Amino acid sequence: YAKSVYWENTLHTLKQRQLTSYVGSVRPLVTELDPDAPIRQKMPLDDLDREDEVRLL
Amino acid sequence: NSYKKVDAAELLRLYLNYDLLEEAVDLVSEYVDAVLGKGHQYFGIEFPLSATAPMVWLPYSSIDQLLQALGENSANSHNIALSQKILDKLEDYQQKVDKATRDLLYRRTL
């Protein structure tokens, strides 16, 4: 699903949550984008990146 | 007037357990008036009966038993008047539980 960045959908979701127009539901996600953030924060990715990481591994 | 801010129903159970029927009639008279905004806060109640608040409650099990405990002495006109003093007051209450239910349903269907 990702085709221009690593964890593209979670990166897009964070770049969207920074906008003061975010009238979305706040799904718990990582707030950092190093590859240890899911295990340091004990928080998930969004499931497109979470499929690609499981496919890739 | 400390226990009213904790449980007026456990007090009403005690008053029925001890035959204090006139104190039970005026405790019920104060409790119904507490839910109706004549000092809700003295009965621990956060909010009086309103289509803008949590839903309210009353110990009807104890009130049915109080109306029986009065009516078991039906030869006395005072027991009849004390029973009417509950019943007539429970309709100035329940007509407003009906209206507050209609006012709330018209705020969960818009």
């Binding site: - | 029925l16 357990n17 001890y18 035959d19 009966l49 289509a51 839903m55 309210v56 409650w57 009353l58 110990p59 009807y60 099990s61 009130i63 049915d64 038993q65 109306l67 029986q68 405990a69 019943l87 429970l90 329940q94 539980v97 009906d98 507050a100 239910t101 709330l104 349903l105």
Partner: protein
């Protein structure tokens, strides 16, 4: 006061007010919920079938020495006539394709038909299995034949046997009907004998009443079609001539029966229905004896009887439905129930249908209402289906098989035959439902007390039904956690899907108290059978926990042995290596409480003293003084590097340092001579 009752609902101030949502004491202040339990138990908070009742759905009023034999005998017959397959994780039980089961059941009910108080139900089951004997079972008239018996000779003797069954199922009502009618009307009494084929008694009563020409007519009727056709003319004559209306309607009913006419139309426009007021069996027996030739099949007698009760476009109904044997005699004219589009009949009729019509409905056949006055008694329903499944009938629905198997397994749970509820659930073809249903039921019924009754059921399930014993002890572990016995939880987790659960329980609940009591040999009993490489390679955290406790015990045992026998330096090298391997591993135990800190610290203190005794046996004296080996001669140089890793309390470490300074002062004082 005394407390009063809950005020009855039609005197409640809450009455009718359940919609007043803003007051929860009106919206729910008179609601209640009820909870089921195993064995068909219910916790009732209302009125019976503050307080709560515990109530049980149970069939009849308990004679366990009698009631249980009507379950257990059919079940120990069916368990001879299925195969057990073991090629899946949960075994499957499948019928033996054949006929034998019909005799196992028919002769069992012949023995059971005596003094037993269920005698009405047991006698209806006797009619059902002797009907299966007469349709699909076997013989006393073809076993005499020393050659393979022709299809028609079989069909003839099946009809001769059923031509007894339809008299035997009719006599007690005929014998009461005659006892009442004989003295008021001998014509009705003679007709009642004829509807049971008692033609000798009918002729006898006709000679006794003064009706000797009725006796002559009836004696000549046991074969001849000429008398049937001469009466067929004589009835046509009496009708056309309008002379019928000077003969008794009850006598015209006999003449119509003999003439092979099910209904006769009189010149009055009266009709005489020959099957009127009768039961279902004598109605079918009239079709088998008077409306058909001696050579016809059972299947034609039944189809002509169905042609007598169905709504055609061209003929009225004249035969009757008349029901299972618990609704007979009742006077119940069923006024066509305005929901129930299938009118109830006997299981014996539904089996005769299935013999005559291979695609007839199995649902009306297997429903308990066709068998008994109880919608909960599936005893015969399941044992009929697990004969029809063996007779290669396969057009039941999987919901209807599921409802039959689950209802009969629940009937076996409710009266405590839970091992036979497993036998029923092991006939579930669907493996994923079969394993679940057996693991769930085991998890309810397995006891921590291994009673003679639990042991008999567990040995029955494992040695007959091949149930994987791992689930009996999984169930005992799930029970042991609820009853808090961590020894029986460890020991039942050990017999089951196991490895890790038992180990991580032992290290939190058993290891430290066993060390504190010096009960090493008990803790060993769990740990040496956890230790095998086929098991320990599947245990989390083993080498820093269970292996440390176990190597400590085996180090104590190998010194317990060297303190009793002339053992070799090779074994003392091994002991020193095993002790050195243990110091920097007591270092690594997970401890949760001061019990675990006590176990770890006295293990460490014991190891510091074991190391001294092992090293003084590596440093024995010269052969000039016959003294015992001194643990205070050990070189400091071999003690301190290993004691400087032992987790030991400040008072244990202080007195270890006093022992180490004592041996250091000897390494000095023997260095100055």
């Amino acid at each position: 006061r005394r407390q009063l009752g809950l005020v009855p609902r039609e005197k409640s101030v809450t009455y009718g007010k359940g919609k007043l949502l803003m007051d929860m004491a009106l919206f729910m202040g008179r609601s209640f919920r009820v909870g089921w339990g195993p064995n068909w138990t219910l916790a009732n908070s209302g009125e019976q079938l503050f307080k709560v009742h515990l109530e049980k759905l149970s069939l009849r009023q308990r004679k366990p020495d009698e009631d249980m034999k009507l379950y257990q005998t059919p079940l120990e017959l069916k368990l001879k006539h299925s195969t057990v397959h073991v090629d899946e994780l949960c075994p499957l039980i499948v019928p033996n394709l054949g006929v034998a089961v019909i005799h196992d059941y028919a002769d069992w009910v012949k023995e059971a038909s005596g003094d037993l108080p269920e005698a009405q139900i047991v006698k209806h089951w006797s009619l059902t299995w002797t009907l299966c004997e007469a349709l699909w079972g076997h013989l006393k008239e073809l076993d005499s034949q020393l050659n393979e018996p022709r299809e028609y000779i079989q069909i003839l003797e099946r009809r001769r046997a059923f031509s007894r069954w339809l008299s035997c199922t009719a006599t007690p009502q005929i014998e009461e009907e005659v006892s009442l009618t004989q003295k008021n009307s001998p014509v009705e009494a003679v007709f009642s004998y004829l509807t049971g084929k008692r033609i000798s008694e009918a002729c006898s009563l006709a000679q006794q009443s003064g009706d000797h020409r009725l006796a002559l007519l009836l004696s000549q009727f046991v074969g001849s079609q000429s008398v049937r056709e001469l009466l067929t003319m004589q009835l046509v004559d009496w009708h056309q001539l309008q002379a019928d209306s000077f003969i008794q309607d009850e006598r015209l009913r006999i003449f119509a029966l003999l003439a092979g006419k099910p209904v006769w139309q009189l010149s009055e426009k009266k009709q005489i229905n020959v099957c009127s007021q009768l039961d279902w069996k004598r109605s079918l027996a009239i079709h088998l004896w008077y409306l058909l030739p001696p050579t016809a099949s059972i299947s034609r007698a039944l189809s002509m009887y169905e042609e007598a009760f169905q709504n055609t476009s061209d003929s009225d109904r004249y035969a009757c439905s008349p029901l299972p044997s618990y609704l007979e005699g009742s006077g119940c004219v069923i006024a066509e129930e305005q929901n129930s589009q299938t009118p109830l009949r006997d299981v014996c009729f539904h089996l005769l249908k299935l013999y005559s019509d291979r695609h007839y409905d199995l649902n009306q056949l297997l429903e308990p209402r066709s068998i008994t006055a109880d919608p909960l008694d599936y005893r015969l329903s399941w044992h009929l289906w697990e004969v029809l499944r063996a007779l290669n009938y396969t057009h039941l629905s999987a919901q209807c098989e599921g409802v039959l198997q689950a209802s009969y397994a629940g009937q076996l749970e409710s009266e405590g035959l839970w091992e036979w509820a497993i036998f029923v659930l092991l006939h579930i073809d669907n493996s994923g439902i079969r394993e679940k249903a057996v693991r769930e039921l085991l998890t309810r019924h397995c006891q921590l007390l291994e009673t003679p009754e639990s042991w008999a059921k567990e040995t029955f399930l494992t040695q007959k039904l091949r149930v994987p014993a791992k689930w009996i002890h999984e169930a005992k572990a799930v029970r042991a956690h609820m009853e808090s016995d961590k020894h029986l939880e460890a020991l039942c987790l050990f017999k089951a899907e196991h490895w890790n659960r038992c180990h991580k329980l032992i290290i939190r609940h058993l290891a430290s108290d066993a060390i504190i009591n010096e009960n090493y040999d008990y803790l060993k009993g769990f740990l040496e059978d956890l230790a095998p490489p086929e098991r320990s390679s599947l245990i989390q955290d083993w080498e820093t926990s269970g292996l440390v406790y176990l190597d400590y015990i085996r180090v104590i045992e190998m010194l317990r042995h060297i303190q009793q026998v002339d053992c070799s330096g090779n074994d003392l090298e091994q002991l020193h290596i095993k002790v050195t391997s243990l110091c920097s591993r007591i270092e690594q135990i997970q401890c949760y409480s001061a019990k675990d800190r006590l176990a770890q610290s006295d293990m460490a203190k014991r190891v510091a003293n074991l190391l001294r005794v092992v090293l003084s046996l590596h440093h024995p004296p010269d052969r000039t003084s016959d003294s015992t080996p001194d643990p205070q001669r050990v070189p400091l140089r071999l003690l301190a590097p290993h004691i400087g890793r032992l987790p030991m309390p400040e008072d244990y470490a202080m007195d270890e340092l006093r022992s180490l300074t004592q041996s250091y002062l000897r390494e000095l004082a023997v260095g100055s001579l």
